C-alpha cells in the first residue's frame, strides 16, 4: 500500500485534526490540495466522496470521508485509542467535548462581523467555565502525564491541538489551568509532535481574510 | 447489574438513537426524565455531567455523556460495531453521514420561523440528492441484506431509524429508493427491532410544541 493521501483545501478547517494525529503517530502522508471549486466537483463527480464532502483520505485501499471515521481509524490503527472498552468510553467522552469546542473555533471566522464580539466571548466563557475546568479535573484526579490509561492517546493529541488554537485566540485563557499548561509542554516535546510544530511541516496556519473567501469560492 | 438509566427530556432529541440501539441489542432500560431546570441542576451539582450537558446514560458503573460516546460503547459491548478495523471504518463513515443529517432534523424544531421553510427544504433536498443515493449505492454495490460485512451492525439501525423520520417528513422521498425500502422492512422485522417499533415501547413521538417549550423552559425559565 501507499502513503495516506489527504484531500482538502490548503488550510486548517476540518482536516487539521487528522494532520495532527497522523504526524503525532509518525506517519508520512501526502496532500492533494483542492485549489478551486472545479477541483472539488471533479472529486464529487468521479465518485470519490461518499457524501459529496471533503475531508477525504485515501488510506489502506479506502476512500474515507467524515472527519470522525477518518480519525477513529487512524487512532485504532496506531494504538492511540486506549486498550479496552472503558478506556475508549473515556477517550470518546473527552474527544467529543474537544470536538464541540473546536467546532465553534472552526466556524468563528465565518459568522458575520457584527456577531463576532459575541460569539468569541461565549467561546471564552465556555473555555473558562466548561471545558478547561473539565479537563484540569481529569488531570488533577489521577495525577498522570496522560488523559487516559497512563499513556499517550488521541485525546492527548486532540487537546493539545486545541490548546494551540486557544493560545492563538487569547494567551491568558490557559493561565488559571496549570495542569493543561504542563500537558501542552510534554506533548509538544514528543519527537513526532515536535517535528510537526517546527517550521516547514504540513501544519496549517490560522484563517486570514484570504482563507475565508477562498473557502467561500469552494464550498 | 441493573438496567442502563437514560437521563434526558421526555422526547426524542439526542437520546432517541441510543434508545433504538439499546432495544436493537435486546437490552431493557429505564428512563429518568428531565422535567425542570432543577432536574438538570441536581445532575450537574452531583458532578455527573462532565460538560454540564445531557444526554447522560448510567451504564456498567460509568456515567457516559456525549451521544457518540454513549453509542460507541453500546455498539462495542453488544457486537454491533462490525468485526475489524476496516468494517468499523465503513460503519463510522456511514453513520457519521447519518448523524450529520440527523443533527439537522434535531435542530429544526428550535429554528426561528423566519428560517424554517428554507431549512426544511434543505433537509429534503439533502435526503433526495445526497444521503438516500449514498446508501442506495452502497446496498446495490454488494447486494447484501446489511450495509456492512453482510451482518447486522449499528449502521443498519441508525439508517432505518432515519428512514422512519424521513417518512414522517414526506413519505414520498424513499419511493425512488427500492433497496432502502427493502432494508427498512427487513430490519423492522428483526425480533428486537419489532418489539421496539410496537405501540407502547420507549420509542418516542416526533417533537411537538409542548416538548419544544418544555426544553426551552429547562435551559431558560
Ligand atoms: N454534542 C453533544 C450535544 C449535547 C447538547 O447540546 N445537549 C443539550 C440539550 S440537547 C444540553 O444539555 N445543553 C446544555 C448546555 O449547553 O448548557 C452530544 O452529542 O451530547
UniProtKB/Swiss-Prot annotation, chain B:
Write down which residues bear the modification named N-acetylalanine. 1
Activity regulation summary: The isomerase activity is inhibited by S-methylglutathione (GSMe).
EC number(s) on record? 2.5.1.18, 1.11.1.-, 5.3.3.-
Point out residues bearing the modification N6-succinyllysine. 3
GO MF annotation list: fatty acid binding; glutathione peroxidase activity; glutathione transferase activity; steroid Delta-isomerase activity
Coiled-coil ranges (or none): none
Catalytic activity field? RX + glutathione = an S-substituted glutathione + a halide anion + H(+); prostaglandin A2 + glutathione = prostaglandin A2-S-(R)-glutathione; prostaglandin J2 + glutathione = prostaglandin J2-S-(R)-glutathione; (13S)-hydroperoxy-(9Z,11E)-octadecadienoate + 2 glutathione = (13S)-hydroxy-(9Z,11E)-octadecadienoate + glutathione disulfide + H2O
Q: Which residues bind glutathione?
A: 8, 44, 53-54, 66-67
Q: Which residues form the GST N-terminal domain?
A: 2-82
* Record carries keyword Membrane: no
Listed GO biological process terms: epithelial cell differentiation; glutathione derivative biosynthetic process; glutathione metabolic process; linoleic acid metabolic process; prostaglandin metabolic process; xenobiotic metabolic process
Tissue specificity: Liver.
> Per UniProt, what does mutating residue 70 to A/V do?
No significant effect on enzyme activity. Reduces protein stability
Q: Where in the cell is it found?
A: Cytoplasm
Task: Alphabetically list the UniProt keywords.
Answer: Acetylation, Cytoplasm, Isomerase, Lipid metabolism, Oxidoreductase, Peroxidase, Transferase
pH relationship of activity:
Optimum pH is 8.0 for the isomerization of androst-5-ene-3,17-dione.
Q: Which family does it belong to?
A: Belongs to the GST superfamily. Alpha family.
Q: Report the PANTHER family cross-referenced here.
A: GLUTATHIONE S-TRANSFERASE (PTHR11571), GLUTATHIONE S-TRANSFERASE A1 (PTHR11571:SF107)
Record function comment: Glutathione S-transferase that catalyzes the nucleophilic attack of the sulfur atom of glutathione on the electrophilic groups of a wide range of exogenous and endogenous compounds. Involved in the formation of glutathione conjugates of both prostaglandin A2 (PGA2) and prostaglandin J2 (PGJ2). It also catalyzes the isomerization of D5-androstene-3,17-dione (AD) into D4-androstene-3,17-dione and may therefore play an important role in hormone biosynthesis.
Q: What assembly does the database describe for this protein? A: Homodimer or heterodimer of GSTA1 and GSTA2.
Q: Per the record, what about its domains? A: The C-terminal domain may form a component of the hydrophobic substrate-binding site, but in contrast appears not to be directly involved in GSH binding and is not absolutely essential for catalytic activity.
- The protein, known as: Glutathione S-transferase A1
